[PDB]
Design a protein around this ligand. Sequence first.
Ligand SMILES: OC[C@H]1O[C@@](CO)(O[C@H]2O[C@H](CO)[C@@H](O)[C@H](O)[C@H]2O)[C@@H](O)[C@@H]1O
Ligand SMILES: OC[C@H]1O[C@@](CO)(O[C@H]2O[C@H](CO)[C@@H](O)[C@H](O)[C@H]2O)[C@@H](O)[C@@H]1O
Ligand code: CL
Ligand code: CL
Lengths: 318, 318
Amino acid sequence: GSHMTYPTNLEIIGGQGGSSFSFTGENNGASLEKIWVWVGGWQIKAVRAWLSDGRDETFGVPSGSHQEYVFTPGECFTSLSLWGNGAGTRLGAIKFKTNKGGEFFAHMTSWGLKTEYPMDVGSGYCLGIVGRGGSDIDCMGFMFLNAVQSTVLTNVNYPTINQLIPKVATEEIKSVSFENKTSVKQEQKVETSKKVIKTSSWSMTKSFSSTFSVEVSAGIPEIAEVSTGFSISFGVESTHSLEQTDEKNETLTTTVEVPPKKKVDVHITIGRASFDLPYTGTVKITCKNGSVLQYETKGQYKGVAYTDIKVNTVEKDL
Amino acid sequence: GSHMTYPTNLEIIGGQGGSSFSFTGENNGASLEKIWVWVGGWQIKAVRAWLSDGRDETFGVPSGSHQEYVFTPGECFTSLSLWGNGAGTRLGAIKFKTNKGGEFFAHMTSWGLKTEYPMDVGSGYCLGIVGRGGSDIDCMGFMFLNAVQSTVLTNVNYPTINQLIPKVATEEIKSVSFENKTSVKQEQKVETSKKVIKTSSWSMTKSFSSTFSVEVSAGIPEIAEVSTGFSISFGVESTHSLEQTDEKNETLTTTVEVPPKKKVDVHITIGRASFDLPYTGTVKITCKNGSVLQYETKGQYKGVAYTDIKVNTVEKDL
Ligand SMILES: OC[C@H]1O[C@@](CO)(O[C@H]2O[C@H](CO)[C@@H](O)[C@H](O)[C@H]2O)[C@@H](O)[C@@H]1O
Ligand SMILES: OC[C@H]1O[C@@](CO)(O[C@H]2O[C@H](CO)[C@@H](O)[C@H](O)[C@H]2O)[C@@H](O)[C@@H]1O
Ligand SMILES: [Cl-]
Ligand SMILES: [Cl-]
């Protein structure tokens, strides 16, 4: 009585003729984006499906006109029922409703419908379809991702980061001038504050990111001003959102030495850098039922990062 | 030997004639938004200033054309110098630069400029002007907020929240049906997941919020479904940003009981509420130098909140 749970939920209805097919995003997180259904008198005749990664395949042999459903990003199933043709030999009908208020019903046209099979749609996120086709749709089911506990983008790498030479724009914060009339050392306290807005963005297919709250477990590219240039350090690992912004009041206290019979000009600045670079990582979906679905992904990271506040003092003799 | 610090920085240059004026946002965080300067042969003739709260005053008596500087939100001074008229009886010139690359220089037209007085602009955020005027500008200084350590919106109240009746819109997450053909009670586990995006925002004058990173210490309006109806409670105080979004995967596991020889329909939903109400609070500015500037404020809070996920089951015979 060992019990197995799975990250997907799939119930296939119909007969056992035809040849098996499996058309799902279960290895890359792709979802069902569009479906065309053709019907006959005593069967679903054919199905054409488009997944959000651009795959497009037809099962069975179309005849007549089709019915269409176009799913928008974030649109999930709220319910699904399938019918066989009543004889156990073909799929007979598909009915569903979505979380955007849509409803779709496609059914054989001659024979009356018999036993309805209502399905659990899991999370509501449909990964595609699986079944058997020949001239017709012998059998089919819709594959759903089961309800999700967490969705994490982890194992993030930036494979061009070491090659990259970042452009650091200087922002002026303040300049102050002092003059020391006396023949003895002077010291001046200078306090600086400046609002900095650091941002991080990891791109993601919009279907997946509209449906799930993706946490990011990653290091953030950072800038420090090295004496021989600017290097993009790949910082310490922590948790973020896919689009993240962190504001603060960056501050510094400087004690400026003003020698005798000298004027000192103090110039206070900060450096700003925009990263725009590829990343790779692993999407890890953990379902409520304990199972996991993971897959490798790649995208673009965009970052805005700042140096420390910099103080430059220029001494002159008046 | 005690040491006294202050949250504003103000150095007044010129003579002692005329009458005192003080035109600053040091009681409501308003900043200098626009300035017009008129000059004469041996003086600054007049200054007209506009603060970000809509105040507008003129000091001295204009003659001739004016020079103008218009400050955009977030534009701070990076440097400032003032001159007297050389005789110590009038302000004679104003020169400044800003963090958006601007520069402005207004000076008396006949008498030569003597001693330049360079000023520490503090945070760069100019609260306004203080000085003496009669026919002319006898003396003036620009007041700055000193470098800032933190800016916090706290003591937040929503004085209409008790009168409020909230619009709750119901979103469908999933529905499923079960059938029990036995004369024996049956159980079914249904797991649910749903992405929710909760948002908070407290309005603030754009000049202040563009210059400073404002942390919010507040309770957030929250919504629960009571057996009677829909509660709107304050929440417990915590730290937020002025514009805050929090995504999560809300989840639920439900054990559904199917009584013998019954159909049971399970309808899983969540309630969404939009708040749009007034708030009051206290802005607390703590300077690097330990001093504090506090003032009361008011604005509009906008929120999106959600109830817990709800399960409603209905039963029939079959
Ligand atoms: O009804 C379709 C028609 O086609 C045939 C033979 O070409 O069978 C093909 O299609 C069936 C439905 O997809 C499959 O079950 C079968 O395996 C496949 O050869 C006829 O047998 C059938 O009547
Ligand atoms: O500066 C012009 C002229 O104004 C007079 C009055 O005619 O003085 C007024 O303006 C001065 C500059 O603002 C003030 O110092 C003075 O207090 C005020 O009465 C003249 O004295 C002066 O020459
Ligand atoms: Cl059947
Ligand atoms: Cl002078």
